[PDB]
Design a protein around this ligand. Sequence first.
Ligand SMILES: [Ca+2]
Ligand SMILES: [Ca+2]
Lengths: 253, 253
Amino acid sequence: AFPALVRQDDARYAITVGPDLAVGPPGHAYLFGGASMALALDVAAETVGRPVVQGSLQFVSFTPLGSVLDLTVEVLQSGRTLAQARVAGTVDGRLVFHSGISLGMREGFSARQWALAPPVPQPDNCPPCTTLPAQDDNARYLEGIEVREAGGPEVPSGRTRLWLRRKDGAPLDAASLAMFADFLPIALGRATGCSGNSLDNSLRITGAAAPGWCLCDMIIPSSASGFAQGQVTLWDQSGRLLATGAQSLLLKG
Amino acid sequence: AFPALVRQDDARYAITVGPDLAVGPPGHAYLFGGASMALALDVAAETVGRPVVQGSLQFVSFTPLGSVLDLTVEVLQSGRTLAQARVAGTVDGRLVFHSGISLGMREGFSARQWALAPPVPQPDNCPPCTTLPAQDDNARYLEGIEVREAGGPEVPSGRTRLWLRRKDGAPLDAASLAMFADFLPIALGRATGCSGNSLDNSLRITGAAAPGWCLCDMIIPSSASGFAQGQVTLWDQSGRLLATGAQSLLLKG
Ligand SMILES: [Ca+2]
Ligand SMILES: [Ca+2]
């Protein structure tokens, strides 16, 4: 998932943040929140040796483009049915994020889905998204993602539905899902009319998928007192629910 | 919110878990997950001196009925626009949960709601819920809540909609919302047909309300590999969105 990620040991990892993992408006370039989540989940799974079920990450401070991000993993428990870990991200010893992650995978249970995918057009029947927010020329994460509008002429209030596809053809693994889940700030800009910053990221993974299109199905249901919240469901191209996510955001104003 | 909660200082609090805060099937009585979340949010707001925006809590171990729960608060930051804290719960020094919470309240912003409440009957037009899971006679949290069925004859797949009201007439504050958000295990039992345990609790608060009925609007969208996930929206009786929540659960099997 992250070739540039270096493991010092079980528990300690580091990665230098390059333009490919950076976002921001002109004049700003920092590590994409979703990438932070992806990295936290990656190091947790790699340290524990089992797949992520869910994770929550709180953003404490910004990680500028070019920083070395140190990730430290603490395993709180690892039994036959479940493991739990915490992952701290630091730059130069400064805390930039902390997280709690549950890991596990049990045999003997069926896969079940009660939720039904919204009836959006298939990807090749959707136009490119020409309204992504302006980005610093050195913040190039978004350049690596193909985005199409899936919401149609009458998308409901507060909703944003995008087809997303990694240009690098990576599978729709935990890392990819964590990254796509952090497209909620774009949904906020649409809901408000203003092209906020995340306070946190939460991801709940039901299953992964092979490379392809992901329906990024978002809602911003409410805001008050300078903050907003959003929820997202990540589907494959065939209506299978891969993951859900959510976050709260600090409004620009 | 919690009269029995004792503050030792900024940062350190304790509460003895009595039957009123306990749940479980016969033979088991432990601190209600939602109460854990409520307590974590309570101590964070009390230590920081501002209201909660969101919180996530990871359950590490069980807190038996009768335990003294120690809560320790660490403030990671407290500026003009936002504060962040972590809260650890321990019993006899043993970690039972850890959490990350964002706090703040900014002047000069409007309240906005894009989400529309489902068109369920009003509380007095809904029958009592006679199918709550059996509880140990010493696990009496549920006894203090009036529950009515809001879903109607054709509630959609995976959904559970309940009207909830505290018999003690407390307002629909952060504590109450955290507790009601943790009714998702009941939604899981309905979705599966089996009367799981939470791995975590997440809560995002937009606003509070005066005492009354709360529409507890839940979905279990998917499950796989021995785990499931759920999401919940908490509304007042008039269609205002108060909070949302989510969690992942370990399936009994
Ligand atoms: Ca290991
Ligand atoms: Ca204080």
